[PDB]
Design an enzyme around this catalytic site. Structure first.
Site, PDB file in Angstrom:
ATOM      1  CG  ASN A   1      -1.351   1.491   1.679  1.00 25.62           C
ATOM      2  OD1 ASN A   1      -2.267   1.859   0.874  1.00 25.62           O
ATOM      3  ND2 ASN A   1      -0.803   2.159   2.635  1.00 25.62           N
TER       4      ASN A   1
ATOM      5  NE  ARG B   1     -11.792   2.284   0.934  1.00 25.26           N
ATOM      6  CZ  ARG B   1     -12.351   1.394   1.538  1.00 25.26           C
ATOM      7  NH1 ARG B   1     -11.976   0.061   1.659  1.00 25.26           N
ATOM      8  NH2 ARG B   1     -13.781   1.558   1.153  1.00 25.26           N
TER       9      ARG B   1
ATOM     10  CG  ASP C   1      -1.668   5.697   0.317  1.00 27.76           C
ATOM     11  OD1 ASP C   1      -1.272   4.874   0.963  1.00 27.76           O
ATOM     12  OD2 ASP C   1      -2.740   5.923  -0.562  1.00 27.76           O
TER      13      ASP C   1
ATOM     14  NE  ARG D   1       0.462  -9.006   7.270  1.00 26.76           N
ATOM     15  CZ  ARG D   1       0.741  -8.056   8.069  1.00 26.76           C
ATOM     16  NH1 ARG D   1      -0.388  -8.360   9.065  1.00 26.76           N
ATOM     17  NH2 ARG D   1       1.127  -7.081   7.638  1.00 26.76           N
TER      18      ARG D   1
ATOM     19  CG  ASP E   1       1.092  -4.234   5.732  1.00 25.73           C
ATOM     20  OD1 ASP E   1       0.922  -4.241   7.088  1.00 25.73           O
ATOM     21  OD2 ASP E   1       1.563  -3.089   5.450  1.00 25.73           O
TER      22      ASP E   1
ATOM     23  CG  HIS F   1      -4.608   2.015   5.530  1.00 30.30           C
ATOM     24  ND1 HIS F   1      -5.283   3.077   5.855  1.00 30.30           N
ATOM     25  CD2 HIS F   1      -4.721   1.087   6.389  1.00 30.30           C
ATOM     26  CE1 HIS F   1      -5.370   3.083   7.133  1.00 30.30           C
ATOM     27  NE2 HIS F   1      -4.983   1.863   7.573  1.00 30.30           N
TER      28      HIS F   1
ATOM     29  CD  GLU G   1      -3.026  -4.949   9.382  1.00 26.39           C
ATOM     30  OE1 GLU G   1      -2.672  -4.581   8.120  1.00 26.39           O
ATOM     31  OE2 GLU G   1      -3.065  -4.661  10.359  1.00 26.39           O
TER      32      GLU G   1
ATOM     33  CG  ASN H   1      -1.399  -8.628  14.713  1.00 29.74           C
ATOM     34  OD1 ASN H   1      -1.274  -8.322  15.963  1.00 29.74           O
ATOM     35  ND2 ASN H   1      -1.597  -8.290  13.574  1.00 29.74           N
TER      36      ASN H   1
ATOM     37  NE  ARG I   1      -1.438 -14.489  11.930  1.00 27.20           N
ATOM     38  CZ  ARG I   1      -1.657 -13.247  11.347  1.00 27.20           C
ATOM     39  NH1 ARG I   1      -1.291 -12.795  10.307  1.00 27.20           N
ATOM     40  NH2 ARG I   1      -2.345 -12.429  12.318  1.00 27.20           N
TER      41      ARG I   1
HETATM   42  C1  LIG Z   1      -0.230  -0.531  12.766  1.00 26.62           C
HETATM   43  C2  LIG Z   1      -1.786  -0.643  11.984  1.00 26.62           C
HETATM   44  O1  LIG Z   1      -2.269   0.740  11.780  1.00 26.62           O
HETATM   45  C3  LIG Z   1      -3.485   0.902  11.360  1.00 26.62           C
HETATM   46  O2  LIG Z   1      -4.327   0.197  11.859  1.00 26.62           O
HETATM   47  C4  LIG Z   1      -5.346   1.161  12.619  1.00 26.62           C
HETATM   48  C5  LIG Z   1      -6.926   0.782  12.599  1.00 26.62           C
HETATM   49  O3  LIG Z   1      -7.167   0.872  11.093  1.00 26.62           O
HETATM   50  C6  LIG Z   1      -7.980   1.629  13.292  1.00 26.62           C
HETATM   51  O4  LIG Z   1      -9.055   1.195  13.242  1.00 26.62           O
HETATM   52  C7  LIG Z   1      -7.468   1.289  14.650  1.00 26.62           C
HETATM   53  O5  LIG Z   1      -8.263   2.165  15.715  1.00 26.62           O
HETATM   54  O6  LIG Z   1      -6.012   2.072  14.950  1.00 26.62           O
HETATM   55  C8  LIG Z   1      -5.058   1.335  14.043  1.00 26.62           C
HETATM   56  C9  LIG Z   1      -3.800   1.991  14.657  1.00 26.62           C
HETATM   57  O7  LIG Z   1      -3.563   1.948  15.849  1.00 26.62           O
HETATM   58  C10 LIG Z   1      -3.461   0.033   9.841  1.00 26.62           C
HETATM   59  O8  LIG Z   1      -4.869   0.062   9.488  1.00 26.62           O
HETATM   60  C11 LIG Z   1      -3.066  -1.429   9.888  1.00 26.62           C
HETATM   61  O9  LIG Z   1      -2.793  -1.706   8.664  1.00 26.62           O
HETATM   62  C12 LIG Z   1      -1.575  -1.452  10.784  1.00 26.62           C
HETATM   63  N1  LIG Z   1      -1.021  -2.617  10.615  1.00 26.62           N
HETATM   64  C13 LIG Z   1      -0.256  -2.870   9.465  1.00 26.62           C
HETATM   65  C14 LIG Z   1       0.222  -1.876   8.672  1.00 26.62           C
HETATM   66  C15 LIG Z   1       1.618  -0.960   8.926  1.00 26.62           C
HETATM   67  C16 LIG Z   1       2.157  -0.031   7.905  1.00 26.62           C
HETATM   68  O10 LIG Z   1       2.778  -0.793   6.956  1.00 26.62           O
HETATM   69  C17 LIG Z   1       2.733  -1.150  10.118  1.00 26.62           C
HETATM   70  O11 LIG Z   1       2.718  -0.120  10.846  1.00 26.62           O
HETATM   71  C18 LIG Z   1       4.121  -0.303  11.492  1.00 26.62           C
HETATM   72  O12 LIG Z   1       5.016   0.353  10.774  1.00 26.62           O
HETATM   73  C19 LIG Z   1       4.886   1.686  10.483  1.00 26.62           C
HETATM   74  C20 LIG Z   1       5.960   2.276   9.478  1.00 26.62           C
HETATM   75  O13 LIG Z   1       7.401   1.730   9.969  1.00 26.62           O
HETATM   76  C21 LIG Z   1       4.967   2.379  11.895  1.00 26.62           C
HETATM   77  O14 LIG Z   1       5.187   3.877  11.725  1.00 26.62           O
HETATM   78  C22 LIG Z   1       6.488   4.574  11.728  1.00 26.62           C
HETATM   79  O15 LIG Z   1       6.845   5.150  10.703  1.00 26.62           O
HETATM   80  C23 LIG Z   1       6.212   6.574  10.407  1.00 26.62           C
HETATM   81  C24 LIG Z   1       6.829   7.089   9.087  1.00 26.62           C
HETATM   82  C25 LIG Z   1       6.044   7.211  11.509  1.00 26.62           C
HETATM   83  N2  LIG Z   1       5.146   8.608  11.408  1.00 26.62           N
HETATM   84  C26 LIG Z   1       5.863   9.524  11.476  1.00 26.62           C
HETATM   85  C27 LIG Z   1       6.436   9.959  10.367  1.00 26.62           C
HETATM   86  C28 LIG Z   1       6.105  11.477   9.541  1.00 26.62           C
HETATM   87  C29 LIG Z   1       6.661  11.814   8.228  1.00 26.62           C
HETATM   88  O16 LIG Z   1       6.953  10.660   7.291  1.00 26.62           O
HETATM   89  C30 LIG Z   1       4.688  12.073  10.077  1.00 26.62           C
HETATM   90  O17 LIG Z   1       3.865  12.645   8.911  1.00 26.62           O
HETATM   91  C31 LIG Z   1       3.866  11.208  10.714  1.00 26.62           C
HETATM   92  O18 LIG Z   1       2.629  11.958  11.082  1.00 26.62           O
HETATM   93  C32 LIG Z   1       4.809  10.571  12.072  1.00 26.62           C
HETATM   94  O19 LIG Z   1       3.896  10.007  12.903  1.00 26.62           O
HETATM   95  C33 LIG Z   1       5.561   6.566  12.806  1.00 26.62           C
HETATM   96  O20 LIG Z   1       5.786   7.563  14.025  1.00 26.62           O
HETATM   97  C34 LIG Z   1       6.335   5.541  13.017  1.00 26.62           C
HETATM   98  O21 LIG Z   1       5.960   4.625  14.123  1.00 26.62           O
HETATM   99  C35 LIG Z   1       3.753   1.988  12.754  1.00 26.62           C
HETATM  100  O22 LIG Z   1       3.791   2.778  14.045  1.00 26.62           O
HETATM  101  C36 LIG Z   1       3.705   0.591  13.019  1.00 26.62           C
HETATM  102  O23 LIG Z   1       2.720   0.158  13.608  1.00 26.62           O
HETATM  103  C37 LIG Z   1       2.143  -2.586  10.921  1.00 26.62           C
HETATM  104  O24 LIG Z   1       3.037  -3.310  11.540  1.00 26.62           O
HETATM  105  C38 LIG Z   1       1.184  -3.620   9.819  1.00 26.62           C
HETATM  106  O25 LIG Z   1       0.931  -4.822  10.630  1.00 26.62           O
HETATM  107 CA   LIG Z   2      -3.665   3.721   0.255  1.00 26.85          CA
HETATM  108 CL   LIG Z   3      -2.234  -9.870  10.803  1.00 25.93          CL
END
Ligand SMILES: C[C@H]1O[C@H](O[C@H]2[C@H](O)[C@@H](O)[C@H](O)O[C@@H]2CO)[C@H](O)[C@@H](O)[C@@H]1N[C@H]1C=C(CO)[C@@H](O[C@H]2O[C@H](CO)[C@@H](O[C@H]3O[C@H](C)[C@@H](N[C@H]4C=C(CO)[C@@H](O)[C@H](O)[C@H]4O)[C@H](O)[C@H]3O)[C@H](O)[C@H]2O)[C@H](O)[C@H]1O
Ligand SMILES: [Ca+2]
Ligand SMILES: [Cl-]
Ligand SMILES: OC[C@H]1O[C@@H](O)[C@H](O)[C@@H](O)[C@@H]1O
Length: 496
Positions: A100, A158, A167, A195, A197, A201, A233, A298, A337
């Site tokens: 995504n 999305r 995105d 899977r 990911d 979105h 996911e 997970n 899983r």
């Molecule tokens: C982690 C899941 O997030 C979303 O779920 C939300 C639900 O949709 C919602 O209903 C619920 O209430 O709340 C949930 C969130 O708590 C997604 O829907 C879900 O798919 C996610 N799980 C998936 C997806 C991802 C993304 O690929 C993984 O997320 C982890 O990895 C990211 C990226 O490394 C990490 O974020 C880190 O990196 C970004 C860039 C930082 N953001 C900062 C940077 C900038 C500049 O680019 C600013 O603009 C941003 O505002 C600033 O915050 C983050 O701080 C940093 O942590 C996520 O934190 C990880 O969780 C999951 O692993 C995967 O399983």
């Molecule tokens: Ca998207």
């Molecule tokens: Cl998962």
């Protein structure tokens, strides 16, 4: 897309979180294969950005910079070797496809990547793919910040940036094709499924367009015309704009309500009791069993990320975790899983773990090998839940009773519960603060069965509790509220 494509008789997959390809290959031959595990979900195998602040967090692998099979888990040779060796012992490999988005828009331009590929997030330059500014949704996102400001608007979630991640414009055929070529390469290598990911979105249609371009599974191990297994996911705990049902056409979907509710019931929170689990499954408002991929925890929710909250059970709460996993592995609902984690130094300040970022066991950035101890446990801080007797024996249980219907339910109107699976297995639980001592109908043929939770059947003896079942299927179960494992499970294959 719904069939897991596992070797016949195998019913579960393990998430070997952050494991190195070589260690997984070994694990397939020495344990997963012999122990009837269906397959393994691996961490993103494609190149990611190197996050130095904090020091190599686990989440940096969710920020792609190219589609080169080059990460801390290993290189393409090691990846190919693992897939071959695992398929060869009957264990399938499922890839975590991060499609995504690319890396954080705020990341610095340079070669601080796992494979040395250059990238410039600021200008949306990803030379190694290649991707350029017009392959991203910046122009389509309508929010002021360009990020998801409201989860009540399908378009923002999305078309806008998930936590600052660039995105991808998945409606473009170019992007669709780049992603398909990446997935197709994996399929040809021997991978059985993916899977998807952060599916929530992406538009279900865009994912579909990508899936339609995929190759059939490699005939060296799979029957001709086999379609890859797909699980998306999609975090949907109900009461939100996007519903998991919007993705049923692409494949199975992660049922996050399963772990959230089960954790609450097993912990006995919000007035919930195990006796309420009688109509577990679709009766609780879950998606259809054949569209579901279920789990207790997970990689995300075991450390506060994603969804589930405090109710989620993890290896940290070993005792309750084992009963929840046991219940899941015994119940016919969904495709299961099992999680396999690593220990990290938790540090809760204000009910928030400030160390939730800690990456896998490492030596100055390089991932430590999974050492196996004489007692079959793991060293180097890998917890290896999949090796816990209570868990590995329940995986076996699921294989043994596969296809048998839920039957012979019993409960004490509180937290003592029991049910069987046809005439091939029966499980009893005691989560009440008092003794369980009852003669229950197991639905199993008469004989002496080894309890697979407290022990194993070695030759013609049980190493743990033995259960004598009369000719009429009844047996007595005595479980103390202070038992190490407050549950017993027996099946056709643990019979003496
Ligand atoms: C982690 C899941 O997030 C979303 O779920 C939300 C639900 O949709 C919602 O209903 C619920 O209430 O709340 C949930 C969130 O708590 C997604 O829907 C879900 O798919 C996610 N799980 C998936 C997806 C991802 C993304 O690929 C993984 O997320 C982890 O990895 C990211 C990226 O490394 C990490 O974020 C880190 O990196 C970004 C860039 C930082 N953001 C900062 C940077 C900038 C500049 O680019 C600013 O603009 C941003 O505002 C600033 O915050 C983050 O701080 C940093 O942590 C996520 O934190 C990880 O969780 C999951 O692993 C995967 O399983
Ligand atoms: Ca998207
Ligand atoms: Cl998962
Ligand atoms: O029948 C299913 C329902 O049973 C109730 O007793 C529980 O409180 C609910 O959480 C559950 O969805």
């Amino acid at each position: 897309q719904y069939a897991p494509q596992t070797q016949s008789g195998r019913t579960s997959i393990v998430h070997l979180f952050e494991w190195r390809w070589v260690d997984i290959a070994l694990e397939c031959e020495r344990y997963l294969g012999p122990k009837g595990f269906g397959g393994v979900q691996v961490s993103p195998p494609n190149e990611n950005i190197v996050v130095t602040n904090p020091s190599r967090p686990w989440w940096e692998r969710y920020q792609p910079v190219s589609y080169k099979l080059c990460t801390r888990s290993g290189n393409e040779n090691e990846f190919r070797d693992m897939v071959t060796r695992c398929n060869n012992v009957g264990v399938r490999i499922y890839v975590d496809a991060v499609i995504n988005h690319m890396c954080g828009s705020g990341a610095a331009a340079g070669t601080g990547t796992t494979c040395g590929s250059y990238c410039n997030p600021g200008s949306r330059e990803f030379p190694a793919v290649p991707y350029s500014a017009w392959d991203f949704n910046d122009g389509k996102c309508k929010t002021a910040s360009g990020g998801i400001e409201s989860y009540n608007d399908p378009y923002q979630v999305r078309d806008c940036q998930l936590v600052g991640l660039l995105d991808l414009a998945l409606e473009k055929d170019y992007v669709r094709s780049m992603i398909a070529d990446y997935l197709n390469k994996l399929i040809d290598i021997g991978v059985a499924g993916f899977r998807i990911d952060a599916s929530k979105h992406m538009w279900p249609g865009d994912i579909k367009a990508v899936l339609d371009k995929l190759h059939n599974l490699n005939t060296n191990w799979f029957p001709a015309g086999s379609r890859p297994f797909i699980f998306q996911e999609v975090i949907d705990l109900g009461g939100e704009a996007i519903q998991s049902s919007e993705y049923f056409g692409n494949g199975r979907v992660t049922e996050f309500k399963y772990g959230a509710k089960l954790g609450t019931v097993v912990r006995k929170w919000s007035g919930e009791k195990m006796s309420y689990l009688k109509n577990w499954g679709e009766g609780w408002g879950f998606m259809p069993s054949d569209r579901a991929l279920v789990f207790v925890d997970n990689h995300d929710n075991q450390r506060g990320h994603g969804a589930g909250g405090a109710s989620i059970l993890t290896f940290w709460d070993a005792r309750l975790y084992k009963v929840a996993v046991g219940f899941m592995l015994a119940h016919p609902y969904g495709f299961t899983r099992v999680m396999s984690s690593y220990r990290w130094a938790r540090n809760f300040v204000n009910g928030e773990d400030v160390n939730d970022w800690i990456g896998p066991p490492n030596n100055n950035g390089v991932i430590k090998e999974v050492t196996i101890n004489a007692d079959t446990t793991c060293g180097n801080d890998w917890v290896c839940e999949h090796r816990w007797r209570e868990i590995r024996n329940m995986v076996w249980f699921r294989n043994v009773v596969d296809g048998e219907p839920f039957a012979n339910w019993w409960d004490n109107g509180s937290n003592q519960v029991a049910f069987g699976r046809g005439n091939r297995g029966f499980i009893v639980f005691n989560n009440d603060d008092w003794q369980l001592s009852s003669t229950l109908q197991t639905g199993l043929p008469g004989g002496t069965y080894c309890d697979v939770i407290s022990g194993d059947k070695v030759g013609n003896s049980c190493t743990g509790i033995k259960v004598y079942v009369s000719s009429d299927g009844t047996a007595q179960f005595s479980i103390s509220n202070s038992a190490e494992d407050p549950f017993i499970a027996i099946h056709a294959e643990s019979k003496l």
